[PDB]
Design a binder for this molecule. Structure first.
Ligand code: NDP
Ligand code: NDP
Lengths: 310, 310
């Protein structure tokens, strides 16, 4: 039994902490705005995959300093707050703890590493899941749920790194989730950008969920074009992605239920968009490699304009 | 004294017909939805350039067949209706009349020519003007007003074509407007696309007038990038545009008052956008020349998506 801490208990943190808790793990949740309702009424899950689940009472905390030392810390905050998140991770971390970022974007682990003791293992958890927060304390899970883990940095040698990635994957596997050990976390993060770059921004820019974006031929063509820019940028930075990856990803999105990306909810609620990790970072990597992404560049500009307007 | 007919009496047709009428010309206005208010109360102009002007009574018509034969026909409809407009132009045209399209876009004259008798002179009038309709019968003119004329097709040889272009320019010059005879109408239309392609679409896509688009650094950079695509496409199709044209156009737009492009009003009022002439036509010309315009292509796709959404 690992002791798990969830740092940022939103849609992602709530889902994975609840799943792990349901599987017999000792899970401790750090909450912010919704601490009162969850501490009181608990956490509940509507899921088309796993059915209804409820955790009550919850081991809930409003301050990381109150949390006991945890062996695995699942970071479910958005990447926008990661700098301010580091002191909270450090406080809840047992010695040699594993820090696992359940976060989208590129360069996420690298930008956090200077704020974590080198004695902590820092891993990335790429989650392929359609989930959002409903009413407070209620998690709305529409599809998928798998987590692909990769190792960024920490005191482990290569052999130990693979063992630790497998330990994390086993945690999620024991809970009834799909989990995969990745050999190359950066490659995996580039792969995931092919979906998140078009769908997250375009859902805000065109105020639309996934199904209308796929059903209209102009947005569908635009999504495919953006995917090829991300695929081309990844290759230019030394990360070749599979043949016909765009067609595959587009097909999976057709099969997907009508879904509002996380960025859609952020703009709806006036929360800052994860532009830095999802757009700014791969655009910077692309320019360093001499590869231009005109549609992605323009999307990022449009989203920045939208965030500045009254 | 030329007899002038205005076919489509909106912001552009109202302005130029009124200006010409104020200068002593015999002007006859074809109106549609606003015929009742203008036939009754007349046409009035608030202008920061020319001050207030009013034409009352107006020679107003709801049917082109009622109009007398006109020597010059000023077409102020949007380009979306040009196919349906041709029988109206033919009816109001005196023998050998001059048809002058006060319309944005590319290939406008070419697409109309098959529907006009070869005995009519078909010219393009590129209007550089900030104008929109206010209340019915009221024209809101914020800045500029100049018209650059070019000859597309008709029974005139080169010498005669230049003479006729100069005759048109003189009409507007006599009315107190800036007017220029252009040697190459297609070149002039490509030039004008450099402004209309970014500003018309982006004002709809980002729901913004010109001043916020210029004041935000991300949209300003995006506008400049789009301009270079249009400039590059024009060159690829054999129409070299001047050095530093983008910087000049951007500077003029800074000097410009806060302006909502015509396309902004169209989307606000549920009217179809002039996508075919402003985006589809130059994109097709570019692809024929082997030159891709990724930002313009994506903007057109986004605007088409927006027009299809409920
Ligand atoms: N298929 C995919 O690609 C998916 C990936 N994601 C990604 O996962 C990450 C999180 O997404 P998501 O769960 O949907 O976002 P949410 O807003 O739903 O949850 C984020 C949680 O982190 C909390 N948080 C931030 N800072 C703190 C802090 N100091 N202390 C306590 N709590 C904090 C927030 O609290 P508070 O509510 O008070 O603000 C919030 O509850 C993102 O990077 C997202 O892109 C998300 C969904 C699907
Ligand atoms: N600086 C620039 O680039 C500028 C250029 N333009 C361009 O000029 C052209 C017209 O623009 P604008 O005046 O602003 O648009 P408006 O909508 O204001 O006016 C168009 C007029 O044409 C009328 N119309 C269309 N079909 C008919 C018909 N069968 N019979 C009678 N009337 C008809 C419309 O009548 P109804 O009202 O009933 O629909 C309308 O009054 C466009 O191509 C536009 O892009 C416009 C402004 C600035």
């Amino acid at each position: 039994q690992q002791r798990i801490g969830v740092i940022g208990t939103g849609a992602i943190g709530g889902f994975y902490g609840l799943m792990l808790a349901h599987a017999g793990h000792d899970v401790h949740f750090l909450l912010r705005s919704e601490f009162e309702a969850v501490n009181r009424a608990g956490l509940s899950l509507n899921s088309a995959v796993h059915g209804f689940r409820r955790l009550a009472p919850v081991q809930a905390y409003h301050s990381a300093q109150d949390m006991p030392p945890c062996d695995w810390l699942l970071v479910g905050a958005k990447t926008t707050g990661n700098h301010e998140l580091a002191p909270l991770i450090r406080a809840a971390a047992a010695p040699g703890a594993k820090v696992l970022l359940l976060q989208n974007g590129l360069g996420v682990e690298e930008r956090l590493r200077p704020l974590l003791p080198e004695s902590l293992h820092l891993l990335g958890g790429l989650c392929f899941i359609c989930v959002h927060r409903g009413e407070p304390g209620v998690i709305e899970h529409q599809a998928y749920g798998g987590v692909n883990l990769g190792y960024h940095s920490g005191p482990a040698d290569e052999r130990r790194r693979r063992e630790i990635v497998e330990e994390g994957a086993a945690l999620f596997r024991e809970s009834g989730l799909e989990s995969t050990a990745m050999p190359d976390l950066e490659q995996a993060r580039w792969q995931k950008l092919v979906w998140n770059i078009p769908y997250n921004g375009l859902s805000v820019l065109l105020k639309s969920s996934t199904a209308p974006l796929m059903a209209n031929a102009d947005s569908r063509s635009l999504i495919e074009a953006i995917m090829e820019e991300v695929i081309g940028a990844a290759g230019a930075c030394g990360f070749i992605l599979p043949e016909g990856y765009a067609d595959q990803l587009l097909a999976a999105t057709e099969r997907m239920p009508d879904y509002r990306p996380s960025m859609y909810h952020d703009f709806a609620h006036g929360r800052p968009l994860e532009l830095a990790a999802i757009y700014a970072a791969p655009l910077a990597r692309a320019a360093a490699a001499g590869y231009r992404m005109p549609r992605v560049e323009a999307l990022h500009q449009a989203l920045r304009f939208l965030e500045a307007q009254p």
